[PDB]
Amino acid sequence: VTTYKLVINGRTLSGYTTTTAVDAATAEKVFKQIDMVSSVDGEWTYDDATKTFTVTEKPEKL
Amino acid sequence: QGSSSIVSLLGIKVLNNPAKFTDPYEFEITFECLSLKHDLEWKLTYVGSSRSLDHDQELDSILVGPVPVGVNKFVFSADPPSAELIPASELVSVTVILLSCSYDGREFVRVGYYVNNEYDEEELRENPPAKVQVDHIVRNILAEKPRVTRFNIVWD
Amino acid sequence: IQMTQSPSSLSASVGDRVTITCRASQSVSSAVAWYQQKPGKAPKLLIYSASSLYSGVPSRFSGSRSGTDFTLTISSLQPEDFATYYCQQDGWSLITFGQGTKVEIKRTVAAPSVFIFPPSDEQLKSGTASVVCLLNNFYPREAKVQWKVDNALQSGNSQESVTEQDSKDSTYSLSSTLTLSKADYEKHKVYACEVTHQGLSSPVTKSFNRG
Amino acid sequence: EVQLVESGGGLVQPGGSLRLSCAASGFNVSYYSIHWVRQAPGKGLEWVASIYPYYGSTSYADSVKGRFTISADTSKNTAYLQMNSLRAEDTAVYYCARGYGWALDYWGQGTLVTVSSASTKGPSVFPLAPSSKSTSGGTAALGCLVKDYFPEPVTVSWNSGALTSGVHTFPAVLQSSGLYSLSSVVTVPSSSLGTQTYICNVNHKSNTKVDKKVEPK
């Protein structure tokens, strides 16, 4: 029931999105359903203090 | 609470409702002032609307005496309409009336009402005569739903 | 509900004289008003009590009734008058509005510029593939977008969107997007978008390969 | 000064309940009639409800009879439209307007009321990549596709305000999913494709403020 944030940080994509979920775990799955962010090449980090996730691109192919 | 129109209308009660077509119009009116002194003129207009005709007709006119600052209540008894001029179809149809007050020839308020006129016995309503009989016309004013219009005039 | 208004759409030129009639249910001249509505803005009052023009409206606007047929007349159409006009009937128990009449500037015929946009890998990766056909700065609004995938004609999977007539060039622009499952998208080579418009002497086709 | 300002618009679920209010400035609500008029997107004006001076007393459209109620508090000089048992079809902009006799002179700017069982969902921007397909006589077309958001509105701007000429942000379109989707395009010189840089700024007040760079091919 808290406002969770996601920060998107990629070559082309850059911005922030909010969702509301009971626990950060569902907030994550919610965030994952945005086809924008479902770019499989993504780091991903979270901070419970500010309640914001963060996803970073990086080629990492092989 | 904007800074316009020194005379504001607070409440208009129609006392004789329903009434016969030929009964006068009983308007208890309460308003508020401020106070320039030029007397307030109150007029009641009858507007009827047929296919080819739009007929307006001034029922009566009264002027209020002193300009007492504050809340005032007075009664307007207006002479009933002259059926001679009204289009025959609109005698037992829906018409309007326009209670309008004015200052020094410039009207600042106009309250319009819907009037339904119809016959008083069931057989006149089911079978109305080829020639209207105003004696059996009973009018009924939509007094609860006034259509108010306000205008900006120069009092001072 | 909704009173019948005619014409429901109207292409006029500046300096024309337009008459819009509202077929109302009652003859009471007090109860009909006429409004102008520009897109995304609130409507504004033009005529009240069938024939009286609201303060500060130009003299070219004028309202008149005839039985239960009320009409609004614009004597000389000005650029600023192009809009949607509604009539209203404040009745005994209900208020009713007309369907509205949209008045759009006539201009010279203007063929569209056609662009097609492949699905893009970012979205393709997530499993949906949406293709986009773009028709730019074209007049008149009446135009036909045909999707063809491997020359097979597609109907149903498409969705169109049209801009409002432009203030400056008085043209339209349309965007047919065609969304497809990644699975269907990958079964097909040629994606073509065929535009039929009267500005074009033949229908044109923009196509691309990759699926 | 005289003006009317509605508030309270938002998203509600079928069955839901929402109260709009419209705040009166200048005239005071006690002397005028006050009406609620709604407009579904790309549909005409539809009258909802009316409250008449001196004696209260309400008229309601039949589609809203019994579910909506209209009122005005002279102390706070505001009117309210309490919409219960909401249905999907009540989705519209809700204007509040002041009565001028049998007409309506002054209109609020209007609030959007969405009734739907689809849940709020921020958009996902994808690139409309300018190709050599888009090169037509030395001018090329590129844009952004804003997909699967809810509820309306979305705001697109190109180069954060810089690119305003030639842009065409199409109207939202509700998809079979129940979610809105729209594209914004701009035509630019075909030379500038390689060299100039073009980013669209999408805003979906899911409080989503995303920038996306549109790159060729």
3-state SS string for chain B:
CCCCCCCEEEEEEECCCCEECCCCEEEEEEEEECCCCCCEEEEEEEEEECCCCEEEEEEEEEEECCCCCEEEEEEEEECCCCCCCCCHHHHHCEEEEEEEEEECCEEEEEEEEEEEEEECCHHHHHCCCCCCCHHHEEEEEEEEEEEEEECCCCCC
- Distance between CA atoms of residues C120 and C6, nearest Å: 45
Residue B95 with chain C: CB contacts under 8 Å: 28
Distance separating alpha carbons of residues D79 and D29, to the nearest angstrom: 8
Q: Examine the domain organization and report whether D106 and D153 are in the same domain.
A: no
Q: Is D33 exposed, middle or buried (0-12, 13-18, 19+ CB in 10 A)?
A: buried
Q: What is the Cβ-side half-sphere exposure of residue D57, based on CA atoms within 13 angstroms?
A: 13
Chain-chain contact of C65 with B54 (C-beta, under 8 angstroms):
yes
- Paired strand residues for D143: D128, D185
**Residues whose CB is less than 8 angstroms from the CB of residue D97 and which lie 6 or more positions away in sequence, other chains included:** C42, D4, D34, D35, D36, D37, D104, D105, D106, D107, D108
**C28, C90, C92 ranked by CB distance to B49: nearest:** C28
HSE, side-chain direction, 13 A CA sphere, residue B10: 11
Range of the domain at B121: 8-150
Find the CATH number of the domain harbouring B29. 2.60.40.1490
Residues D174, D106 share a domain:
no
Q: Considering D94, D115, D136, which residue would you say is the last residue of a domain?
A: D115
Q: C125 and C190 share a domain? A: yes
Q: C87 with C25: CB under 8 angstroms?
A: no
C125, A40: Cβ pair inside 8 Å? yes
Residue of A nearest to D125 (CA): A36
**Architecture of domain A2-56 in this structure:** Roll (3.10)
Q: Is D212 on the interface with A (CB under 8 A)?
A: yes
Residues 6+ apart with CB under 8 A from C171: C107, C110, C137, C138, C139, C165
Domain count, chain C: 2
**How many residues are listed for chain C in this entry?**
211
Do C150 and C168 share a domain, yes or no? Answer: yes
C82 phi and psi angles, rounded to 5 deg: -65, 120
Q: Is the peptide bond before C140 cis (omega within 30 degrees of 0)?
A: yes
Report d(CA C42, CA B134) in Å as an integer: 45
What is the amino acid identity at position A61? K
Residue A34 and residue D147: Cβ atoms within 8 Å? Answer: no
Alpha helices in chain A (DSSP H): 24-32
Quick one: how far is CA D140 from the chain centroid? 31
Give me the number of domains chain B comprises. 1
Domain boundary among C80, C105, C130: C105
Q: How far apart are CA B16 and CA B104, in angstroms?
A: 30
Task: Pick C128's closest partner by Cβ from A12, A35, A40.
Answer: A35
A13–D contact, CB cutoff 8 A: yes
Closest CA relative to residue C136, chosen from D187, B106, B31, D201: D187
**DSSP conformation class of C163:** P
Chains B and A touch (3+ CB pairs under 8 A): no
Chain A closest CA to C136's CA: distance in Å? 26
CA distance C158 to C149: 12
Gap between the Cα atoms of C23 and C2, Å rounded = 10
Using the Cβ of D202 and the Cβ atoms of chain A, whether some distance falls under 8 Å is answered with yes
Domain that holds residue D105: 3-115
At what resolution in Å was this solved? 3.0
Q: Looking at C105, C133, C167, which one is the last position of a domain?
A: C105
Set of chain B residues whose Cβ sits within 8 Å of the Cβ of C90 = 147
Please list every residue in chain D whose beta carbon sits closer than 8 Å to the beta carbon of residue A15: 202, 208-212
Residues C197, D76: Cα–Cα separation, whole Å: 56
**8 Å CB contact of B148 and D32:** yes
Cα–Cα dist D179/D30, whole Å: 41
Nearest to D100 by CA among B6, B109, B141: B109
| Torsion angles phi and psi, residue C79, rounded to 5 | -45, -40
Strands, E assignment, D77-172: 78-83, 92-100, 103-107, 111-115, 124-128, 139-149, 155-158, 167-169
Asked whether C185 and C95 are in contact (CB, 8 A), the reply is no
Q: Which of B49, B112, B142 shows the shortest C-beta gap to C27?
A: B49
Which of the 8 DSSP states describes residue C121? H
Q: Does A38 touch chain C (CB under 8 A)?
A: yes
Could you tell me which of D146, D143, D165 has the C-alpha nearest to residue D154? D146
Taking CA–CA distances from A35, the nearest residue in chain C reads: C126
Indicate contact of C with B: 3+ CB pairs under 8 A.
Answer: yes
Residues D98 and D158 in one domain: no
Cβ-defined contact of B145 to D59 (cutoff 8 Å): yes
Sequence length of chain B is 156
D60 touches chain B (CB under 8 A): no
D90 and D130 share one domain:
no
Closest CA to C98 of C4, C17, C177: C4
Write the DSSP assignment of D169-193 as a string of letters: EPPPEE-TTS-EEEEEEEEEESTHH
Q: How many Cβ pairs closer than 8 A exist between chain B and C?
A: 29
Secondary structure (3-state) at C98:
strand
Resolved by: X-ray
Taking one residue from B and the other from D, the number of pairs with CB-CB distance under 8 angstroms is 38
Q: What is the CATH number of the domain that holds C25?
A: 2.60.40.10
Residue C208's CB: how many other CB atoms inside 10 A? 17
- Give the closest of A11, A12, A16 to D209, CB-based: A16
Angle subtended at Cα D94 by Cα D92 and Cα D96, rounded to the nearest 5 degrees: 165
Residues from chain C contacting residue D47 (CB–CB below 8 Å): 88, 94-97
Q: Do C86 and C8 belong to one domain? A: yes
Range of the domain at C167: 113-209
The two tokens of residue D135 are 């090169």
CA–CA min distance B98, chain D (Å): 10
Residue C183 is encoded by which pair of tokens?
């699975």
CB D212 within 8 A of CB D125: yes
Q: Which of C177, C178, C182, C206 to mutate to test the interface with D (most CBs of D within 10 A)?
A: C177
B145 inside 8 A of chain D by CB: yes
**Strand A2-9 with A52-56, pairing:** parallel
Last residue of a domain, one of C74, C105, C136: C105
Give the residue from D27, D166, D22 showing the smallest Cα distance to B3. D27
D89 to B28, B63, D50, D92, D151: CA distances (angstroms): 44, 52, 20, 8, 15
Is the distance from CB of D94 to CB of D18 less than 8 angstroms? Answer: no
CA D109, D72, B114, D94 torsion-angle sign = positive
At C61, give phi and psi (nearest 5°): -80, 140
The verdict on residue B142 lying in a domain is yes
Chain D residues 117-146 with a CB less than 8 Å from chain A: 121-127
B155 domain residue, yes or no: no
Q: How far apart are CA D64 and CA B19, in angstroms?
A: 33
What is the identity of the amino acid at D215? E
Statement to judge: residues D129 and D111 lie in one domain = no
Chain D: residue nearest B145 by CA? D52
- Whether A7 and A18 have beta carbons less than 8 Å apart is answered as no
Q: Which residue on chain C is closest to B114 by alpha carbon?
A: C92
Question: Whose structure tokens read 């309202």?
Answer: C63
Distance CA B93, CA C148 (A): 62
CA distance B101 to B40: 7
Asked if D129 and C118 come within 8 Å (Cβ–Cβ), the reply is yes
Chains that touch C (3 or more CB pairs under 8 A): A, B, D
Tell me the backbone φ, ψ of residue D151, rounded to 5 degrees.
-90, 175
Domain locations in chain A as residue ranges: 2-56
CATH of the domain at D108: 2.60.40.10
Beta bridge partners of C44: C36
How far does CA C55 lie from the centroid of its chain? 30
Pairing mode, strands B70-78 and B54-64: unpaired
